[PDB]
Amino acid sequence: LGDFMDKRDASIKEQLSGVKDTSSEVKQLEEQANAVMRAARAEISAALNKMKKETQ
């Protein structure tokens, strides 16, 4: 019975941690996506400027 109690409690605590783990993983995913999108935009802008300046 002691083992059963432990198993159930661990299963629940583990579920909470995983749920906590998943939330952090999704926050990281969102941050990475945001950073990547910024790079695209900024990168291209810089490119044109440098390219625009060279053309000029």
């Binding site: 019975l1 002691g2 059963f4 159930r8 629940i12 579920q15």
Partner: protein, 223 residues
């Protein structure tokens, strides 16, 4: 009325009542436990939260009394709680004056002292085992380290912890039962209920105190 009881012989005489009564205690404990253990669920179902909260309570008392290494002694202190608690509550609530023994009343495993001084020797073996396990074999708590002339008091102290712990539990269960018996002859069952309540209130506590105090002696070994 009677503090007499009937022995059973295997070349030596052992009380019949205490074996039968503690057998009912072992059966009710393993029966409800192996009921509660069969289908564990992540979220505590009906009836398993009680066993779970029991385990939580035991863990807390051992942890407070022992310390960081509470988790090896949890089955021992849990058995000291549950066997003594279920012993007293089985003596109180299970109607056994309907049952007529050959020579004696059947009330509890703890009524005969034998149970009390056996449980005290088991806590003595427990704190001696903790003290000769974790600490130096050469010496344990008993050394007259604080003062050499503190030896007589200290040597005496070792004897007393099992005797007081053996005696308090034993006297208390027996005293409570006697009051119920000595009241009942004088009067019918209706008058005595409050008294039984009071005794039932102590019946768990002298259990709990025992387990608590037993855990505390483990701590005095580990330091």
């Amino acid at each position: 009325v009677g503090q007499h009881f009937y022995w059973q012989i295997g070349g030596f005489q052992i009380h019949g009542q205490v074996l039968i009564t503690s057998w009912v205690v072992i059966a009710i404990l393993l029966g409800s436990a192996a009921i509660a253990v069969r289908s564990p669920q992540t979220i505590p179902t009906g009836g398993q939260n009680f066993f779970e909260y029991v385990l939580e309570f035991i863990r807390d008392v051992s942890k407070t009394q022992i310390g960081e290494e509470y988790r090896p002694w949890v089955p021992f202190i849990g058995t000291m709680f549950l066997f003594i608690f279920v012993s007293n509550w089985s003596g109180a609530l299970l109607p056994w004056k309907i049952i007529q023994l050959p020579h004696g009343e059947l009330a509890a495993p703890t009524n005969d002292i034998n149970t009390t001084v056996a449980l005290a020797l088991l806590t003595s073996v427990a704190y001696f085992y903790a003290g000769l396990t974790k600490k130096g074999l050469g010496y344990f708590g008993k050394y007259i380290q604080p003062t050499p002339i503190l030896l007589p008091i200290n040597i005496l102290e070792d004897f007393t912890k099992p005797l007081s712990l053996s005696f308090r539990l034993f006297g208390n269960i027996l005293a409570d039962e006697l009051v119920v018996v000595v009241l009942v002859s004088l009067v019918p069952l209706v008058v005595p209920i409050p008294v039984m309540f009071l005794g039932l209130f102590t019946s768990g506590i002298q259990a709990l105190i025992f387990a608590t105090l037993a855990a505390a002696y483990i701590g005095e070994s580990l330091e």
